[PDB]
Design a protein around this ligand. Structure first.
Ligand code: WWZ
Ligand code: WWZ
Ligand code: NAG
Ligand code: NAG
Ligand code: NAG
Ligand code: NAG
Ligand code: NAG
Ligand code: ZN
Lengths: 277, 277
């Protein structure tokens, strides 16, 4: 069993309860340090694209730790190389947020926390035929991190919730774990257009929940998408699962890990991308 | 379904036959370039050590593609950190060699091929309770590469074959795949004493046979251990398995892979270690 807020099963214990791989030295999240990172001009614009033949439904679940969108198979894809040949297939999207507006994100950018971080999870379909084959295997996953920031003055249509279609109104106090509901499809291409998809951090890391598998190619966009206080408070209405100490879901983030803990046997490097200047 | 010397199943076909993961961009072996490597002073002396109360038998097999020593469980270990707490457990040792003395190794050092490269394969017991659990999982394996060079003048006792106890005389034309034979134990601590265990290349790579899993922590010692022409010739009497074109086992090495093929989404770095000096 694991939690965020029960000190007995909480993040400080994962290294002992899930040594494979929460005890590793390629863990996530990390502080994304603009100064320390290596600018790699070969890293291209990220594209998110849909199969316009797909008609299957999208669902969202309160899994007791997060709000998790589950996408249908063969619907949403990532391209890192400009070809639309289905190398990365999107499986789900989940969120991490704070009890308060000054924290919530798992990654930090130069020490700064955002109120809400979204994780678009994909598998390397180029190599693995199914999500369940990729999830536990080397190099199986690529995750996109989308930072969200609160603004006071904005039209609904320019907020991230327009891409999310408000999650069909499911973010409320009655959305109890482990309830799942059908929702309107998420326009992930619109979501990505709300930020600069050429401007990102890139590194090799891990899942941020047990078992913290070190098979994630991370991409974290530097520019946030925009939301309102009203929208962040919808997430804060969700109840935590019964194994949490806190009642309302919030502070569902993992503490910062080092890029290179002292025990590492082969240092990793944090990379940075920016547009063909 | 794979070979070294049959053009239908040979190394040029593995990226097609075993896309997961022989098509990847973290492949082994690589050219170990002294000038284009990063010195990491934190990388410590390698220690190999035995459980003195283990009594189980060692075997060697002609598996049709290499000579493979199979160690009993819970017997031989590697420490990278100076602690003897069974973080890495040795499973097996296999050999790669050439038809001729000018080639054989998988790795090169500044483009130089050695006549014989030994691979001491361990699983990360720190995280994974068994080899079968580790071999397919992220960060599962650590392999030591031992280069061997031929000298004309040496006492048997100062050759690598002293540490191998001459493979108990088992190596001949009759040692046919998939036969195994019980052998006297390999003194891997003696073997490591024959080179400088502080002086090595380090990088994240792959198995060098299918399915080329990208879960190997590589350590390749820069100084070779010494053998005679008679000793290399004992390997060359082994017969290849029937799916090979060549009759006698030789040239059982994979072609050199790039450190960073053009399609990489996160560059790896080659490290090197040297002594506190
Ligand atoms: N928070 S995170 O690092 O983005 C993350 C991503 C994915 C998971 N888990 C996941 O996707 N599980 C899964 C299980 C079975 C499947 F078939 C596919 C995915 C956990 C944490
Ligand atoms: N030549 S190499 O890269 O050192 C290598 C090492 C190990 C393997 N394979 C291996 O160790 N397989 C294995 C299978 C089942 C087990 F339970 C244990 C090991 C293949 C290539
Ligand atoms: C697109 O969706 C259709 C029908 O749902 C499906 O048969 C097809 O395989 C999908 N394409 C890809 C590339 O997954
Ligand atoms: C989403 O929520 C806002 C605020 O209540 C509303 O104006 C908007 O039309 C809603 N959109 C959809 C698609 O439900
Ligand atoms: C050492 O040897 C014996 C072999 O029988 C075994 O009971 C013990 O668990 C071994 N220790 C380790 C650390 O594997
Ligand atoms: C080593 O084994 C070979 C056969 O593989 C044998 O012909 C040779 O004499 C042996 N050498 C020693 C020193 O035991
Ligand atoms: C090794 O050889 C013996 C005797 O022929 C056999 O019974 C044993 O199972 C073999 N081990 C293998 C194939 O792992
Ligand atoms: Zn090998």
């Amino acid at each position: 069993e694991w939690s965020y807020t029960n000190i007995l099963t909480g993040p400080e214990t994962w290294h002992e309860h899930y040594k494979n791989m929460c005890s590793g030295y390629y863990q996530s999240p990390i502080d994304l340090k603009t100064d320390i990172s290596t600018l790699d001009l070969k890293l291209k614009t990220v594209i998110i694209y849909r199969n316009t033949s797909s008609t299957e439904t999208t669902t969202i679940q309160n899994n007791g730790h997060s709000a998790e969108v589950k996408f249908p198979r063969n619907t949403w894809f990532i391209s890192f190389d400009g070809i639309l040949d289905y190398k990365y297939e999107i499986i789900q999207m989940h969120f991490h947020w704070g009890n308060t507006d000054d924290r919530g994100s798992e990654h930090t950018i130069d020490g700064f926390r955002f109120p809400l971080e979204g994780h678009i999870v994909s598998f390397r379909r180029q190599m693995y035929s199914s999500p369940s084959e990729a999830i536990g295997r080397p190099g199986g996953l690529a995750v996109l991190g989308i930072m969200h920031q609160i603004v006071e003055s904005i039209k609904y249509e320019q907020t991230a919730f327009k891409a999310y279609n408000n999650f069909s109104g499911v973010l409320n106090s009655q959305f109890v774990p482990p309830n799942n509901s059908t929702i309107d499809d998420i326009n992930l291409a619109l979501l990505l257009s709300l930020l600069n998809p050429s401007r990102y951090f890139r590194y090799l890391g891990s899942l941020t929940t047990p078992p913290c598998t070190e098979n994630v190619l991370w991409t974290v966009f530097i520019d946030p998408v925009l939301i309102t206080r009203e929208q962040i408070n919808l997430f804060r209405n969700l109840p935590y699962g019964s194994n949490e100490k806190q009642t309302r879901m919030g502070d569902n983030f993992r503490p910062i890990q080092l890029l290179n803990p002292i025990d590492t046997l082969a240092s990793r490097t944090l990379y940075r991308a920016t547009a063909r200047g």
